[PDB]
Design an enzyme around this catalytic site. Structure first.
Site, PDB file in Angstrom:
ATOM      1  N   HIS C 116      61.932  -0.387  -4.005  1.00  0.00           N
ATOM      2  CA  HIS C 116      60.818  -1.245  -4.411  1.00  0.00           C
ATOM      3  C   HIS C 116      60.146  -0.699  -5.651  1.00  0.00           C
ATOM      4  O   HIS C 116      60.339   0.451  -6.039  1.00  0.00           O
ATOM      5  CB  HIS C 116      59.779  -1.386  -3.296  1.00  0.00           C
ATOM      6  CG  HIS C 116      60.311  -2.016  -2.046  1.00  0.00           C
ATOM      7  ND1 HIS C 116      60.817  -1.275  -0.998  1.00  0.00           N
ATOM      8  CD2 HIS C 116      60.474  -3.316  -1.702  1.00  0.00           C
ATOM      9  CE1 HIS C 116      61.241  -2.093  -0.055  1.00  0.00           C
ATOM     10  NE2 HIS C 116      61.050  -3.338  -0.459  1.00  0.00           N
ATOM     11  N   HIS C 125      67.483  -6.629  -2.921  1.00  0.00           N
ATOM     12  CA  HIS C 125      67.214  -7.643  -1.904  1.00  0.00           C
ATOM     13  C   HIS C 125      68.258  -8.767  -1.966  1.00  0.00           C
ATOM     14  O   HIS C 125      68.595  -9.372  -0.945  1.00  0.00           O
ATOM     15  CB  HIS C 125      65.789  -8.203  -2.053  1.00  0.00           C
ATOM     16  CG  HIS C 125      64.718  -7.228  -1.657  1.00  0.00           C
ATOM     17  ND1 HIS C 125      64.134  -6.359  -2.550  1.00  0.00           N
ATOM     18  CD2 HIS C 125      64.171  -6.948  -0.450  1.00  0.00           C
ATOM     19  CE1 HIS C 125      63.244  -5.610  -1.919  1.00  0.00           C
ATOM     20  NE2 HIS C 125      63.244  -5.951  -0.642  1.00  0.00           N
ATOM     21  N   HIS C 252      55.395 -12.391  -4.424  1.00  0.00           N
ATOM     22  CA  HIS C 252      56.103 -11.634  -3.413  1.00  0.00           C
ATOM     23  C   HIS C 252      55.181 -10.841  -2.491  1.00  0.00           C
ATOM     24  O   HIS C 252      55.205 -10.911  -1.265  1.00  0.00           O
ATOM     25  CB  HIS C 252      57.105 -10.636  -4.018  1.00  0.00           C
ATOM     26  CG  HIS C 252      57.726  -9.887  -2.917  1.00  0.00           C
ATOM     27  ND1 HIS C 252      58.389 -10.512  -1.844  1.00  0.00           N
ATOM     28  CD2 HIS C 252      57.765  -8.507  -2.690  1.00  0.00           C
ATOM     29  CE1 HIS C 252      58.818  -9.537  -1.007  1.00  0.00           C
ATOM     30  NE2 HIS C 252      58.454  -8.289  -1.479  1.00  0.00           N
ATOM     31  N   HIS C 256      53.730 -11.403   1.863  1.00  0.00           N
ATOM     32  CA  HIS C 256      53.728 -10.310   2.817  1.00  0.00           C
ATOM     33  C   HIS C 256      52.318 -10.040   3.334  1.00  0.00           C
ATOM     34  O   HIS C 256      52.096  -9.931   4.540  1.00  0.00           O
ATOM     35  CB  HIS C 256      54.301  -9.031   2.182  1.00  0.00           C
ATOM     36  CG  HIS C 256      55.798  -8.959   2.189  1.00  0.00           C
ATOM     37  ND1 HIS C 256      56.496  -8.218   3.115  1.00  0.00           N
ATOM     38  CD2 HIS C 256      56.730  -9.533   1.389  1.00  0.00           C
ATOM     39  CE1 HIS C 256      57.793  -8.329   2.885  1.00  0.00           C
ATOM     40  NE2 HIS C 256      57.964  -9.119   1.842  1.00  0.00           N
ATOM     41  N   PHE C 273      56.515  -2.811   4.612  1.00  0.00           N
ATOM     42  CA  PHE C 273      57.963  -2.855   4.432  1.00  0.00           C
ATOM     43  C   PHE C 273      58.719  -2.445   5.698  1.00  0.00           C
ATOM     44  O   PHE C 273      59.789  -2.977   5.991  1.00  0.00           O
ATOM     45  CB  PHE C 273      58.459  -1.907   3.349  1.00  0.00           C
ATOM     46  CG  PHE C 273      57.906  -2.138   1.971  1.00  0.00           C
ATOM     47  CD1 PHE C 273      57.661  -3.403   1.478  1.00  0.00           C
ATOM     48  CD2 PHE C 273      57.689  -1.042   1.153  1.00  0.00           C
ATOM     49  CE1 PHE C 273      57.172  -3.569   0.176  1.00  0.00           C
ATOM     50  CE2 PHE C 273      57.216  -1.196  -0.128  1.00  0.00           C
ATOM     51  CZ  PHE C 273      56.959  -2.463  -0.616  1.00  0.00           C
ATOM     52  N   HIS C 286      62.135 -14.029   1.380  1.00  0.00           N
ATOM     53  CA  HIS C 286      62.885 -13.317   0.368  1.00  0.00           C
ATOM     54  C   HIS C 286      63.992 -14.163  -0.233  1.00  0.00           C
ATOM     55  O   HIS C 286      64.381 -13.938  -1.378  1.00  0.00           O
ATOM     56  CB  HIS C 286      63.441 -12.019   0.921  1.00  0.00           C
ATOM     57  CG  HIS C 286      62.734 -10.827   0.387  1.00  0.00           C
ATOM     58  ND1 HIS C 286      62.982 -10.321  -0.869  1.00  0.00           N
ATOM     59  CD2 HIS C 286      61.752 -10.068   0.915  1.00  0.00           C
ATOM     60  CE1 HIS C 286      62.191  -9.290  -1.085  1.00  0.00           C
ATOM     61  NE2 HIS C 286      61.435  -9.113  -0.017  1.00  0.00           N
TER      62      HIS C 286
END
Ligand SMILES: [Cu+2]
Ligand SMILES: [Cu+2]
Ligand SMILES: [Cu+2]
Ligand SMILES: [Cu+2]
Lengths: 347, 10, 347, 8
Positions: C116, C125, C252, C256, C273, C286
């Site tokens: 990341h 990903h 993104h 989350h 994560f 994703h």
């Protein structure tokens, strides 16, 4: 070689380009400036003690609003043939946009000057407003006078401001506007000639989207933001040409079309260059267009830089100033707002 | 400028 | 030198990075993959007869939804230490995002691998989902199985799809989501830790603005879109670092944060994560992130090009596939969706 | 291509 305005008091012809219906025109086509026997002086940078701070039209102080309104009243009260008069100032746009002048000073006496649809768009209108603003301030003894700007990139600034409405007693009013659109109030920056019929909030979001389109998505470099290269010997670039810059062709054009009265033979006033200047809101729209140039640079993105081509830098126009002097001004000299002693009030 | 529908002042 | 995953079945440690409350953590940190005596082999381009067409999660057909639901059910029913299992697939994200592996193969056994917060984000990903999708399809004997994707860039796609809702009887459900936000339904792509108190239509426009920001305004070249350079010898880039790419840091991150349950110690599942993969919607969010890379290239704006730096091209990871074989995959090989035999259903 | 509030 650069486009160079002639002695506009010696070589000038009636406007007859870009006007679809000339015989029914509701404004004059005899747009040539008066002859006072003045010499043309070179521009000198202003020595203003304070920076003129242009104010969003929807959030002016009482003094800002009253000064602007009184200055327009004073401008409308001047004799017609004063180069500072309301109609004389409107005529400038007509002369430079609808074929008043030729490229004689460049060795092309039979080709017109056009300042639209090219890289001349931004600096020409910057200078036009520079003198217009100084003229207004001089008519009411406000040495630090600043124009409003129509902040249609901000939700509450998107409705045409109430200061322009009412009727003939208001110096800021113009009967030649699209009545339906004035009723709707909220300008459509994406206007293409068809009413969208959507919720006000949706139009607000669309306008913001349109500003980002013009300043970021499409205005990716000097060619695409400022417009195409236009030099001595070139004929006028047609409205709608793909080389026209993003703001000029986008939000700029939209406001003109939207405000202009479709019941008039050339959609006067705002709907045609030759008549746009008879609407006080013309200049105030253009003050925000002027601001877009500032904002575009402030984005600090690749390609967001000013033009360095000598044939742009050295292009020049002639205007009457607040002292009724003739002044020749160059593109190169308007790129820095600090040196022209104005800016815009920001959040 | 940079007013967006995400902002509270919107 | 490129970041290179080690033999993940031989060099791996429990996840201990980027989890604020590990003593209270509701998911395991034992995220290392199983050992099955396999040798790591290089990726070969797939021979699929048809391209897998990923479908918007709000517009799935009966067969699309039923197959997805049944595949997730099958995945959940597998023993945990099966590398294809629900838990194993979640653990992949944990191992690569929360410090399971080191850069030992590059000569830096003292430095963890983080995928990341750098240019590794998009291709890691993409590969993760590539194998995930193929695994799911294999579990239900559907050779052309395709994931849904959460099309939060399209107004009707912005509410979390009802296919994920209900209770534990639904395989696509996860109790560890923000209950207030699930009730609100419409995701806030600009979520920053405090609920906006705004009308749904304004949130829709906010989300559209956010996508524009991530893809055009802030994603102006490979560095700003994909994220910062990260090579062997580099320490892990911190969550929230400004060098993170526009989508990763933007839309993104927001989804989350918005889905993650704030009543959980680390805002599990989507809010960290290490736990995000226990929410089926993780992979489907994703899938649209993956699509953003496609869209970004389709814009055909200056700077919207793929990376050519060998230290990116040659970076690699290791995954189990549907045959429980170990496959080493390289960034360079995932840039072309046609060659990976999937894409996304568009308008 | 993505959606904008100006579009039908
Ligand atoms: Cu003009
Ligand atoms: Cu104009
Ligand atoms: Cu991840
Ligand atoms: Cu993620």
């Amino acid at each position: 070689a650069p486009i160079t305005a002639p002695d506009i008091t010696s070589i000038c012809k009636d406007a007859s380009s870009g006007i679809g219906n000339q015989e029914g025109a509701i404004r004059t086509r005899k747009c040539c400036p008066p002859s006072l026997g003045k010499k043309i002086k070179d521009f000198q940078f202003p020595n203003d003690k304070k920076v003129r701070m242009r104010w969003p039209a929807h959030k002016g102080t009482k003094k800002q609003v009253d000064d602007y309104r009184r200055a327009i009243a004073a401008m409308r009260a001047l004799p017609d043939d004063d180069p500072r008069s309301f109609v004389s100032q409107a005529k400038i746009h007509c002369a430079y946009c609808n074929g008043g002048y030729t490229q004689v000073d460049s060795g092309f006496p039979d080709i017109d000057i056009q300042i639209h649809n090219s890289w001349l768009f931004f600096p020409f209108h910057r200078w036009y407003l520079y003198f217009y603003e100084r003229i207004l301030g001089s008519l009411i003894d406000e040495p630090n006078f600043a124009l409003p700007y129509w902040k249609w990139d901000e939700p509450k600034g998107m409705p045409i401001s109430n200061i322009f409405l009412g009727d003939a007693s208001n110096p800021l009013y113009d009967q030649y506007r699209d009545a339906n659109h004035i009723e709707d109030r909220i300008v459509d920056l994406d206007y293409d000639g068809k009413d969208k019929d959507i919720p006000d909030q949706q139009q607000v979001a669309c306008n913001l989207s349109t500003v980002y389109r013009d300043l970021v998505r499409n205005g990716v470099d000097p060619t695409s933001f400022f417009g195409g290269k236009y030099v001595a010997g070139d004929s006028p670039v047609a409205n709608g040409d793909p080389s026209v810059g993003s703001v000029e062709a986008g939000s700029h054009t939209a406001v003109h079309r939207w405000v202009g009265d479709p019941t008039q033979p050339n959609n006067e006033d705002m709907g045609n260059f030759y008549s746009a200047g008879y609407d006080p809101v013309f200049y105030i729209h253009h003050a925000n267009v002027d601001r877009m140039w500032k904002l575009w640079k402030e984005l600090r993105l690749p390609g967001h830089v000013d033009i360095t081509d000598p044939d742009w830098l050295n292009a020049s126009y002639v205007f009457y100033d607040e002292n009724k002097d003739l002044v020749r001004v160059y593109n190169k000299d308007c790129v820095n707002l600090d040196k022209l002693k104005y800016n815009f009030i920001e959040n | 400028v940079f007013t967006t529908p995400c902002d509270p002042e919107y």
